[PDB]
């Protein structure tokens, strides 16, 4: 009985790799960024980066390399997966659509061999002759590169050298030659081997083995004008080449290890280097021309340009622009300057890209006291540390709220032909019309002398020549502003009522059922121009000029009534150009034509809450993209509003949606509101850049939030945050963080920069006397953070050498107070395990932080959890329950303990508990007879756990060292005294992330069961839910069919990819389903869509809908 569902809620945001070249075309400069399973492809432009294509791989990317083989148009792409899927890819832009073709591919796994330390390295020879792979210790796999070998059959060659640190092919070699630093006792050395692929050996190298620094770790192959290698180490950098040897020991380098490099100038006269501390360096090579003897290397030099943010990834682009790919902090575009600016930096940031960093810990809070779901994360590390607040949907802040029932339309109004700020609002009601004035933040209800009030208004705008139009159902009126009078009035030849309005600024198009009349507002008179009659009754109309004319609309959008169809007309005539029959018999509700980017959009929404969208030339009228994307269930009404640069579209419904722009797509995000029926833009004298919104019975006006589907707040900390707990009754957060100080000349610690713990509004240090028994030191604190302003209210620093490891917010025993409890540990470098720590109880209740209790404890307080009125703490392989005395003292019964190392811990409101001991998941219940915990059950089958969660009483989610998820369940069968002691892996699944935190919660609420969010090292954020027999099978069905349909980049089976894989075993996946796969069903053509469907009922529509109910899960 095991059925689980898993979706991405936020795609991975950490950058794992990035590379530069010519892959879009030979005549382009691209940036290729590797997220986890994601390849992103940019064009380096002049403003910055132009996205072109974002693609999913069924595999963690581990090698990403561009190269052009002999006689080749553009660059090709080599990709090696962590599960050893190889492939070579091509960028084919054939049509107006873009594809990634698999020119070759195969799996390069070896049945033999241990995965090397320093990991998979992949490299490509300058001649493009071959691909070198270092996957396993003692083995070097060569893949020969020729026009054939579309399977990448390869061969291994024994590598005599046990333990290779880094490898590159050397430039300018009369045969592929390898260069590498390896380790044997005696330190490290650098060596060469020619690759003889002819006979599959190594031969000799083109130059002797040489010793290198103990910490040497990067090899750079310098290109042809120079040749040889650079070897970057600790405290020393050296050039090697034949008998030529150069070396420097610049002191600046001596701190932080250099982690990455990039070549700036194709001469290799200049390289960028990056630190762990994010200091960025220029490495310059000095060329010494002979006068006939060509160019030689005189010296090496390094200069500190400044500081980026900690980089996985560094890519010189064009003209002093650098992309900094960051894993532990936000990514960024950075301009390099010749002259050092203020602060003395050569580096100036142009752009910053959001990374949820490693999500180290998190929790869900209904932040602004709404039934929602805000995620708050401890993100990043060291100076990149921060909090992140993740919000779902787009919000709007309520300035004014005048209630007023039964509104049926809204139009903004301005009592001055001069400005662009309005001061009048128009509320059309069922039978009536009442106008509003605006003093500032005031709203009074008199009318305009020229406006009807006894009829219903279908339009109210501003026209031409000091004028203000009302198109009431009885007649289209015209009023002059300066001359306050009805300057003319059009009515229907036979006094029939106007049905559908339509009015830009210089043009009018009404309809009386099937009949249409095009009039004009040429000075001070309503002048008729045209008349046609429609094959059916008109449902909706829209006209707003699109570019080449300002006010004078050349085209007409129209919705009909029986053939449920939309069309494009030509207003001078009305002649029928292109018409499109939709399905069903539900009428078009609204239709609208607008301009966004390099696509002129005309879309139409139906009456059941469905929508269809269409791109179109304002030139002619061709049907473009078409996918039935449903919103609410109320007939949607469409509008245009001014925002940032680009001005967008707001869909009114019971499910308020806003339509933005993606790469060059249109974004679909929730608005965070009850139900909107009508909405207009604004610019008021008392309510500037705003929007007006009406429901069943309220009028509203305010500001609009970002743009994305998830909105993200950032709270920089400039240090490492490790743990976070929300405290409701105190309206704030406790965060444990730590910062790094250094060995002073005074001996002690200094300040490598201001951060949250050093710049807090107030502070306190530990005065405890519990203990009396050139270098880097962590210094740990407890931060108290306002849930509203996110300011660092108070910071308490723990003792010298005390690391805080665990944190909790709870009431204890009989006491009504909420104490934030912190479990610590005295940490010294020489020791393997600590023997000392404390449990401190603090109180934040008034306006400050009080140390209530201290409890000496014989080890490190790895985790803790409020049990059932007591404090369950896991101290260094022991588990002990603590009592909170009424004299405000914590105390245990020292013979009542546990032999468990609970690195991760969770509690079921019952007397239960999921731990981890000696690499396993365990289940324990409290037995008060023994004042103890009993070991109900265990998962034998070993697993290096990374996180752990209770789904319900019988099912337990785990995550592990090999990026796999699993569900353990307790046997419901006989010999309940042996087979009961064994819980069982009912579910398996290769997730491809490293999970640090699960927690019950959702970001959705204002149909399936459950909701567990999770946070990742890559910064991913997932969601997990339970299903049921039918769905799981149906969806399991849908998976296998979906595999056969979908084209996957490097020809990798989803089946292989999602299969649970460790060093020990490879099982297929069980009890799990990736929403990710199940959601890509919507991103298929109706064709391939009707394939997946052949055979309850089963249909392309019955089921399209199923998947959407699932999308609303996150």
């Amino acid at each position: 009985m095991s059925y689980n569902y898993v979706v991405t809620a936020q795609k991975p945001t950490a950058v794992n790799g990035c590379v530069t070249g010519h892959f879009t075309s030979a005549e382009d400069l691209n940036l290729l960024i590797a997220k986890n399973t994601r390849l992103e492809i940019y064009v380096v432009t002049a403003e910055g980066l132009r996205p072109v294509k974002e693609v999913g791989m069924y595999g963690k990317i581990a090698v990403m390399e561009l190269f052009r083989p002999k006689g080749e148009s553009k660059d090709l792409l080599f990709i090696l997966t962590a599960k050893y899927n190889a492939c070579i890819l091509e960028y084919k832009q054939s049509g107006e659509s873009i594809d990634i073709i698999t020119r070759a591919h195969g799996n390069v796994q070896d049945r033999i061999g241990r995965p090397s330390e320093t990991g998979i390295i992949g490299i490509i020879d300058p001649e493009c002759r071959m691909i070198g792979l270092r996957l396993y210790d003692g083995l070097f796999k060569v893949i020969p590169l020729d026009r054939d070998n579309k399977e990448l059959k390869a061969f291994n060659i024994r590598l005599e050298e046990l333990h290779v640190i880094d490898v590159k092919f050397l430039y300018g070699c009369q045969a592929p030659t390898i260069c590498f630093v390896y380790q044997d006792p005696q330190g490290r050395h650098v060596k060469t081997y020619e690759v003889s692929l002819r006979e599959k050996e190594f031969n000799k190298g083109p130059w002797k083995q040489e010793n290198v620094e103990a910490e040497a770790s990067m090899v750079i192959a310098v290109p042809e004008p120079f040749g040889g290698a650079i070897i970057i180490g600790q405290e020393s950098i050296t050039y090697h080449n034949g008998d030529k040897y150069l070396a420097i020991a610049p002191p600046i380098i001596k701190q932080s290890t250099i982690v990455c490099h990039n070549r700036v100038d194709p001469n290799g006269s200049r390289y960028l280097l990056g630190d762990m501390e994010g200091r960025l360096f220029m490495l310059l090579l000095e060329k010494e021309e002979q006068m006939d003897g060509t160019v030689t290397l005189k010296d090496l030099r390094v200069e500190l340009l400044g500081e980026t943010s900690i980089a996985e990834c560094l890519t010189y682009l064009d003209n002093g622009v650098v992309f900094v790919g960051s894993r532990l902090g936000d990514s960024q575009l950075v301009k390099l300057n010749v002259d050092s600016n203020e602060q003395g930096s050569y580096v100036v940031a142009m752009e910053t890209f959001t990374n949820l960093g490693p999500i180290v810990d998190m929790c869900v809070v209904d932040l602004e006291r709404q039934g929602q779901g805000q995620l708050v994360t401890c993100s990043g590390a060291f100076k990149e540390g921060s909090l992140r607040i993740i919000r779902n949907g787009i919000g709007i802040h309520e300035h004014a709220s005048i209630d007023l029932p039964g509104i049926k339309g809204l139009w903004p109004l301005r009592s001055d032909p001069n400005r662009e700020t309005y001061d009048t609002l128009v509320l059309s009601f069922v039978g009536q019309t009442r106008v509003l004035m605006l003093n500032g933040e005031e709203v009074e209800e008199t009318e305009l002398m020229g406006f009807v009030d006894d009829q219903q208004t279908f339009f109210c705008g501003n026209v031409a020549h000091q004028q203000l139009i009302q198109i009431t159902s009885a007649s289209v009126r015209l009023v002059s502003q300066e001359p306050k009078a009805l300057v003319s009035e059009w009515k229907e030849p036979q006094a029939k009522n106007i049905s559908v309005a339509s009015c830009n600024s210089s043009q009018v198009v009404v309809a009386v059922g099937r009949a249409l009349y095009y009039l004009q507002i040429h000075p001070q008179e309503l002048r008729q121009i045209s008349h046609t009659e429609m094959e059916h009754e008109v449902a909706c109309l829209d006209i707003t000029p699109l570019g080449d004319s300002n006010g004078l609309s050349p085209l007409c959008a129209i919705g009909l009534w029986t053939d449920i169809s939309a069309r494009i007309l030509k207003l001078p005539s009305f002649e029928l150009l292109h018409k499109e029959m939709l399905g069903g018999e539900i009428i078009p509700r609204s239709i609208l034509m607008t301009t966004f980017e390099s696509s002129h959009y005309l879309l139409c929404a139906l009456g059941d809450g469905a929508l269809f969208y269409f791109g179109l030339n304002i030139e002619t009228g061709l049907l473009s993209d078409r996918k039935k994307v449903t919103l609410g269930t109320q007939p949607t009404v469409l509008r245009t509003f001014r925002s940032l640069s680009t001005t967008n579209v707001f869909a009114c419904s019971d499910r308020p949606t806003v339509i933005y722009s993606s790469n060059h797509k249109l974004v679909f995000s929730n608005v965070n509101l009850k139900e909107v029926n009508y909405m207009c833009p604004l610019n008021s004298d008392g309510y500037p850049d705003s929007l007006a919104l009406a429901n069943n019975s309220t009028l509203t006006i305010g500001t609009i939030d970002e743009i994305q589907k998830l909105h993200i707040r950032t709270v920089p900390l400039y240090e490492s945050p490790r743990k976070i707990c929300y405290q409701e009754v105190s309206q704030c957060f406790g965060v444990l963080s730590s910062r790094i100080e250094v060995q002073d000349t005074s001996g002690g610690t200094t300040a490598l920069r201001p951060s949250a713990s050093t710049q807090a509004l107030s502070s306190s240090v530990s005065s405890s006397k519990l203990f009396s028994s050139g270098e880097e030191v962590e210094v740990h604190n407890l931060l108290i953070i306002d849930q509203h302003t996110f300011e660092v209210l108070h910071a308490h620093q723990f003792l010298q050498n005390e690391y805080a490891l665990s944190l909790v917010s709870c009431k204890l025993g009989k006491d009504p107070n909420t104490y934030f409890i912190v479990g610590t540990a005295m940490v010294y470098p020489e020791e393997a395990e600590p023997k000392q720590g404390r449990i401190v109880v603090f109180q934040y209740s008034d306006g400050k932080l009080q140390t209530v209790a201290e409890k000496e404890v014989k080890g490190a307080v790895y985790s803790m959890v409020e049990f059932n009125g007591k404090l369950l703490a896991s101290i260094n392989s022991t588990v002990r329950l603590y009592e909170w005395t009424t004299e405000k003292d914590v105390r245990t019964e020292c013979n009542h303990y546990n032999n468990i190392m609970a690195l991760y811990l969770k509690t079921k409101g019952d007397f239960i508990l999921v731990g981890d001991l000696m690499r396993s998941v365990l289940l324990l219940a409290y037995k008060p007879m023994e004042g103890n915990f009993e070991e109900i059950a265990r998962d034998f089958n070993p697993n290096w756990m990374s996180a752990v969660e209770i789904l319900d009483d019988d099912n337990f989610l785990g995550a592990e060292n090999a990026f796999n998820l699993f569900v353990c369940q307790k046997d419901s069968a006989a010999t309940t005294d042996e087979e009961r002691q064994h819980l069982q892996e009912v579910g398996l699944f290769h997730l491809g992330e490293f999970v640090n935190v699960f927690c019950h919660g959702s970001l959705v609420m204002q149909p399936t069961q459950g909701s567990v969010l999770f946070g990742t090292v890559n910064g991913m954020i997932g969601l997990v839910t339970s299903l049921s027999e039918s769905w799981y099978n149906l969806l399991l069905d849908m998976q296998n069919r979906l595999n056969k349909v979908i084209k996957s980049v490097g020809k990798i089976e989803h089946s292989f990819w999602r299969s649970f894989h460790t060093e020990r075993k490879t099982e297929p996946a069980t009890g799990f389903i990736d929403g990710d796969l199940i959601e890509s069903f919507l991103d298929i053509s109706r064709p391939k869509m009707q394939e997946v469907v052949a055979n309850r009922e089963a249909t392309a529509d019955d089921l399209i809908k199923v998947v959407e109910e699932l999308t609303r899960i996150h």
């Binding site: 532990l328 940490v827 020791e831 395990e833 640090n996 090292v1017």
Partner: peptide, 14 residues
Amino acid sequence: NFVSWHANRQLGMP
């Protein structure tokens, strides 16, 4: 130390 091995692991390795 085990302790900082653990803090390293949640960062990945660093």
